[PDB]
């Protein structure tokens, strides 16, 4: 089971929950909230409160201004991970995945100590505590990642596992080197009150030639202890520690360490150190005395340093397959049964039990940002370690985590492109999670919208391509940018929108005597055919590309073809009839007798469908003065061309 605590409590300023109800709605990274109170003055002089709206942005911590570094530098490493070949052998690939792990650690570290300097530079102690809190979260992340790297990615074998776990503690328990600088900077280092604490803590970190050099400042200052301090110091040189460049067995290390233990215990029986109880404690610590190690608890800042100390001095041939028993037994002895473990202890214990899924679960409860769990879970799929379990909604555990991190990248103005990469590697629900976000990217420029269209076109998201192209055609139509409007309705392939933009251009013609573009109507090519009305626009432009292009009878037969088409709007048939007047009353017969019959038919397919209705209103008469004049000039010119045509054509049937 999971989520058995209190649900995460945000406090909203001013808002008076103590009786007042709320309304709300969801945007891409921000939810709105509004309160049901309005303060209609019971006689008090005070300003009445208006209602207030609140913009409540997602807790996934993406808006700490430093962590933008963490997200981009880790996305560069994630594309450095999804571009690794699977046939890269289990030594090349394993070394490369250990580099990918150490690259991610380097980014956590390079965000953490930048934020540490920002916490020191914080000119208010409230802000310094906010940065110090996020430094502690990045420290916990690099602590857990340094362990998961040793156990699951580098997979440290018995022997080297103890070397890995010693510098694992050391690269985070940095308290010791800070204390070393203050003790060594003093006029007499062997007489700083913390000197013996530091000598012990260096032995608890296994730093034995560093502890020997601190013990040398007692030997230089104290010619009474110096002889015994140098027996302790040379036992701190005979300890069998594993050396990676050294061709020995574990059973050689083991048998040599057993002699060293029998030699250290020999000096305890002869009471060699019973003249300085600090050196008597160091011998018990170096012998793995679990009572003397717990007497050092005020020098062991955590239970996992106590565990690694207990492995160094009681089990130098420890294996991964033994390790849970020591981890639990060290947590038991460090907490004593009157304290419970903290969420970090539960994560680190589950890592020492090697349950990757309990580790992923408690990291998903203790950490406010999916970022950590996403990159760690994906790197453990690159190591092929995960249980491939489908969930009740089909998708797998890696996918369920990556979908919520992608639903954190799409919650930001810039990071949505990185959210597309994080949706493509999600096989059950990734594409559908992308298809619900992709249309909601703010399309400020046509150039931005081309990148979003290209992303949909690559992925065959055809209905989202039509959507975005119609949103762009509608951006253009509300701004009357008819060339973008027609080019975007052509990329949408919406024939109703292509007709609608044509039924702007044909009115834009009536409102001027000319179009707002010509090149856009000539260069229609095959896309002219996206509707009948776009073909009429293209071919009426082409009539205006015959009459001006040194030709006429071709233009006249195209004009009659436009009119006899079931496409030409009848509110423009009076125009196409008027466009025939400069061709009919020419000295040459341009239309034949039978072409002149069909032009007259089109005048009656306008005129002899007028209704006979009467008596309102006086306004109207002024264009019927003109319509009757239009119609009589057409009757007269058509009759004149018909008479000239019959005489010309009837003299070519019998000569």
């Amino acid at each position: 089971e999971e989520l058995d605590g209190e649900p995460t409590v945000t406090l909203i300023p001013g808002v008076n929950s103590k009786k007042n109800q709320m309304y709300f709605d969801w945007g891409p990274g921000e939810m709105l909230v509004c309160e049901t109170s309005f303060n209609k003055k019971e006689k008090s002089e005070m300003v009445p409160s208006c209602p207030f709206i609140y913009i409540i942005r997602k807790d996934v911590d993406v808006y700490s201004q430093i962590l933008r570094k963490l997200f981009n530098e880790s996305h560069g490493i994630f594309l450095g991970l999804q571009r690794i070949d699977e046939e890269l052998t289990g030594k090349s690939r394993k070394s490369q995945l250990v580099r990918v792990s150490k690259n991610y650690r380097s980014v956590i570290r390079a965000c953490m100590e930048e934020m540490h300097q920002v916490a020191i530079a914080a000119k208010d102690p409230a802000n310094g505590r906010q940065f110090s809190s996020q430094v502690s979260i990045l420290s916990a992340m690099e602590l857990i990642w340094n362990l998961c790297e040793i156990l699951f990615i580098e997979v440290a074998p018995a022997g080297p596992l103890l070397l890995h776990l010693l510098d694992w503690v050391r690269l985070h328990v940095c308290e010791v080197d800070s204390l070393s600088a203050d003790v060594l900077g003093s006029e007499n280092p062997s007489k700083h009150d913390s000197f013996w604490n530091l000598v012990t803590i260096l032995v608890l970190q296994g730093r034995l030639d560093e502890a020997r050099q601190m013990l040398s400042k007692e030997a230089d200052a104290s010619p009474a202890s110096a002889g015994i301090c140098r027996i302790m110091g040379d036992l701190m040189r005979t300890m069998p520690i594993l050396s990676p460049g050294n061709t020995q067995t574990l059973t050689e290390l083991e048998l040599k360490w057993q002699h060293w233990h029998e030699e250290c215990e020999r000096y305890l029986q002869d009471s060699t150190f019973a003249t300085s109880p600090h050196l008597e404690s160091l011998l018990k610590i170096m012998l793995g005395d679990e009572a003397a190690l717990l007497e050092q608890k005020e020098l062991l800042s955590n239970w996992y340093h106590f565990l690694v100390t207990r492995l160094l001095y009681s089990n130098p041939t420890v294996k991964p397959i033994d390790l849970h028993y020591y981890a639990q037994s060290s947590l038991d002895l460090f907490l004593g049964g009157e304290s419970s473990p903290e969420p970090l202890d539960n994560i680190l214990l589950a890592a020492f039990e090697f349950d990757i899924h309990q580790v992923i679960k408690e990291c998903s409860i203790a950490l406010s940002n999916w970022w950590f769990v996403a990159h760690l879970t994906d790197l453990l799929d690159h190591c092929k370690l995960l249980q491939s379990h489908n969930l009740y909604f089909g998708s797998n555990m890696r996918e369920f985590l990556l979908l919520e991190y992608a639903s954190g990248l799409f919650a930001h103005p810039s990071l949505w492109q990185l959210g597309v990469d994080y949706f493509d590697y999600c096989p059950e629900l990734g594409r559908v999670s992308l298809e619900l976000h992709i249309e909601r990217i703010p399309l400020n420029t046509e150039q931005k919208a081309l990148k979003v269209l290209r992303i949909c076109e690559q992925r065959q998201m055809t209905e989202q391509v039509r959507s975005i192209c119609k949103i762009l055609a509608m951006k253009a139509v509300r701004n009357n940018r008819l060339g973008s409007a027609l080019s975007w309705s052509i990329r949408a392939k919406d024939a109703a929108f292509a007709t609608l933009v044509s039924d702007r251009f044909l009115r834009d013609y009536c409102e001027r005597g000319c179009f707002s573009d010509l090149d856009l109507i000539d260069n229609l090519g095959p896309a002219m055919m996206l509707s009948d009305r776009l073909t009429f626009l293209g071919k009426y432009r082409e009539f205006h590309r015959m009459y001006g292009e040194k030709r006429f009878a071709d233009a006249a037969s195209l004009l009659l073809s436009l009119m006899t088409s079931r496409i030409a709007p009848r509110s423009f048939w009076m125009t196409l009839l008027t466009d025939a007047l400069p061709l009919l009353e020419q000295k040459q017969v341009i239309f034949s007798a039978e072409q002149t019959y069909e032009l007259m038919r089109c005048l009656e397919d306008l005129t002899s469908r007028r209704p006979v209705h009467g008596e309102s209103d006086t306004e109207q008469l002024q264009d019927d003065d003109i319509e009757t004049t239009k119609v009589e000039m057409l009757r007269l010119s058509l009759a004149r061309n018909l008479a000239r045509a019959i005489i010309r054509e009837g003299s070519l049937e019998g000569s």
């Binding site: 999971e2 300023p13 808002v15 929950s17 309005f38 009740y392």
Partner: protein
């Protein structure tokens, strides 16, 4: 959750808030008879760009169309009307000083009683608009032109036979589910044994046939929401009542013999939550339908999510401090 705040300067109680499709604009409506539109700057601020009287009653909702239909708003009212509004570019008539560039294109007037909710359809159904009212009817309207937004047909009166308080369209773009609408009821009568009803468009009759009725929702309903469909073979439906409820609705595969009738559903309650200790007044889903939000008389918005085992739990509480 990081909270920025805005003084809304509505001169009475706000009843609703709604984002645009991109989350770059928001609308809010009030008992002062106004709607306001607020736009999100490229600096990360927000500014009130329009603020006008919409109606003669208290305004009970506000909603946006999908942007392939432009910049269109709908609002419903206690005067028994709904109104459709368009943002026009370059139309601000100085002759009439202090009107909005948000022009009213039409007013729908057919409801005999207060129009309680209004929702545009999923865009793959065209420019359709649903309203509901306390006459116990849902009305579905259609614009046959996206430019002449003055002209709207009335295609359906749906008789719920109980007062209507809220409506939700099913957001399934998949041609394997028919158009569906769920309807809630404010009815306090003990005689009406169920307060949620679900209707399916049956093409063979061109009518919204009643498919289902939620016989476990005996208590009054204030709000209702279908969850956005991540490919699921079953729908999810959130309801606001005396408690929060989450239902699954899984279509029963018709055998090749049950002709002409609606679909039937395998229906479950997956969750029921009392934790508001009070009535629930809104339910809205995140963009992917994985997280529900709901409000109540506790002065908390509460967030609810499925875990990896489909155990729905509360995950967060957004509450005022009054400092």
């Amino acid at each position: 959750f990081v909270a920025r705040s805005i003084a809304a300067d509505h001169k009475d109680l706000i009843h609703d808030v709604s984002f645009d499709f991109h989350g770059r604009r928001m609308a809010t409506c009030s008992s002062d008879q106004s709607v306001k539109v607020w736009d999100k700057s490229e600096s990360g601020d927000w500014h009130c760009t329009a603020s006008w009287k919409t109606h003669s009653g208290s305004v009970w909702r506000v909603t946006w169309a999908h942007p392939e239909f432009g910049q269109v708003l709908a609002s419903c009212s206690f005067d028994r009307t709904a109104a459709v509004w368009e943002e026009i570019v370059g139309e601000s008539n100085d002759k009439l000083r202090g009107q909005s560039h948000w022009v009213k294109r039409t007013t729908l007037v057919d409801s005999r009683t207060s129009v309680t909710d209004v929702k545009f359809a999923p865009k793959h159904m065209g420019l359709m608009l649903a309203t509901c009212s306390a006459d116990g009817i849902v009305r579905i309207y259609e614009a046959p032109d996206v430019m002449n937004l003055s002209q709207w047909s009335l295609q359906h009166e749906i008789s719920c036979k109980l007062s209507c308080s809220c409506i939700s369209w099913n957001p399934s773009s998949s041609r394997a589910h028919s158009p569906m609408i769920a309807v809630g009821s404010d009815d306090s009568s003990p005689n009406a044994m169920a307060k949620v009803q679900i209707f399916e468009y049956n093409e063979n009759t061109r009518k919204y046939a009643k498919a289902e009725t939620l016989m476990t929702v005996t208590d009054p309903v204030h709000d209702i929401a279908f969850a956005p469909n991540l490919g699921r073979s079953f729908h999810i439906l959130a309801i606001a009542t005396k408690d929060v409820r989450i239902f699954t609705l899984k279509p029963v595969r018709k055998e090749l013999t049950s002709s002409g009738g609606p679909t039937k559903f395998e229906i479950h309650i997956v969750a029921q939550f009392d934790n508001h200790n009070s009535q629930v007044w809104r339910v809205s889903w995140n963009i992917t339908g994985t997280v529900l939000a709901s409000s109540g008389d506790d002065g908390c918005v509460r967030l609810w999510k499925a875990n990896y085992m489909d155990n729905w739990k509360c995950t967060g509480i957004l509450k005022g401090n009054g400092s």
